[PDB]
Design a protein around this ligand. Structure first.
Ligand SMILES: CCCCCCCC/C=C\CCCCCCCC(=O)OC[C@H](O)CO
Ligand SMILES: CCCCCCCC/C=C\CCCCCCCC(=O)OC[C@H](O)CO
Ligand SMILES: CCCCCCCC/C=C\CCCCCCCC(=O)OC[C@H](O)CO
Ligand SMILES: CCCCCCCC/C=C\CCCCCCCC(=O)O
Ligand SMILES: [Mn+2]
Ligand SMILES: [Mn+2]
Ligand SMILES: [Mn+2]
Ligand SMILES: [Mn+2]
Lengths: 178, 177
């Protein structure tokens, strides 16, 4: 589609379907949170860190994904190299997790919620770790399924990290505060 | 190149950008803290935070993708940003009303009637503003000589999380308190 020649109505028609699919899939997060209503009610400040946790996961995943998409498209990597990449990214994700978690724990202490220092600290490490792997592996999976990663990698990694991020954080919270 | 670098080298190359983003993203926790009153009154408010901020990010990044492409192929010039701004005003409102209709349905299903106008109004505003942010950012970056490929997407997502939260919680406080 040519942007400069497309009217508002035309742009809406070309954009809406992808957004509808994403928000329908995104509604899952609201159901997840409802299933943890007990823990959310128990500790008020638990909800304060959801956007930065899910957002950091998304940032990490889309960073590693972009690196992989480029590496494959430039033939620096091949589809057969996914295992060696996986093993290497386990280390990178762990190192990134520890670094970012160290900072966020500082914020939690600043905000004055010492009860949440362990749950937030552990959760972000796990979230960065898994989001980094999802980001590194998705371009391989997409390519093998016939669709190039460049077109749809961003919203997929963002949605998956949101779902998996909520599940990790709230589960860690339920085990440590109950 | 990727096949070259080891784990520490990759960590070295990635950490600075992620640190800047999280230091920026930390503001969201401070924003939510400032609305603790209404959050405590209606706990269900927290249920729709990720889907609201996430839809804003999706909208913004979809918009940014189109603009980056048009600038690369010279379908648009740098000075066209005002005309793009005015047109995207309409597109965002149309996408906002469409997506809002769906999410209100989810709220109606979940059984939180108090949040029907809160979530409905917020999503329209969130989509509307996130769309403009996504459309304008490539103009700003190219003006500063920055390549969007590894910068545009995390920036839109973080800006939308902050602005989206400010909209949602302000509407919540207004309608519930
Ligand atoms: C980079 C992160 C920026 C956050 C801005 C807001 C900073 C948070 C403001 C904290 C206000 C304060 O004085 O601290 C509250 C503390 O909980 C007393 O118990
Ligand atoms: C389509 C428009 C909005 C979705 C409205 C329907 C929302 C989907 C159902 C949400 C839900 O949580 O489902 C309940 C579950 O299936 C039973 O236990
Ligand atoms: C297509 C969907 C039609 C739903 C129509 C159902 C109309 C709902 C009846 C009104 C009602 O009692 O709603 C209950 C409320 O959601 C809390 O109990
Ligand atoms: C707010 C929008 C920022 C848009 C920045 C685009 C700069 C374009 C340069 C120009 O005005 O000619
Ligand atoms: Mn309850
Ligand atoms: Mn409570
Ligand atoms: Mn507090
Ligand atoms: Mn996000």
């Amino acid at each position: 589609l040519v942007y400069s020649e497309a009217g508002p109505v035309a742009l809406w028609l070309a954009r809406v379907r992808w957004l509808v699919i994403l928000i329908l899939t995104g509604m899952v997060t609201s159901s997840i949170l409802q299933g943890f209503e007990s823990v959310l009610e128990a500790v008020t400040a638990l909800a304060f860190y959801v956007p930065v946790l899910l957002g950091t996961g998304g940032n990490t995943g889309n960073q590693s994904a972009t690196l992989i998409i480029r590496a494959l498209a430039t033939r620096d990597l091949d589809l057969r190299d996914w295992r060696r990449v996986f093993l290497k990214e386990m280390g990178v994700g762990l190192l990134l997790g520890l670094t970012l978690s160290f900072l966020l724990v500082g914020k939690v202490y600043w905000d004055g919620h010492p009860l949440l220092l362990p749950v937030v600290g552990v959760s972000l490490v796990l979230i960065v770790f898994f989001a980094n792997l999802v980001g590194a592996m998705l371009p391989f999976l997409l390519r093998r399924l016939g669709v190039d990663p460049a077109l749809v990698s961003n919203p997929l990694v963002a949605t998956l990290s949101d779902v998996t991020g909520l599940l990790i954080y709230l589960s860690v919270a339920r085990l440590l505060l109950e």
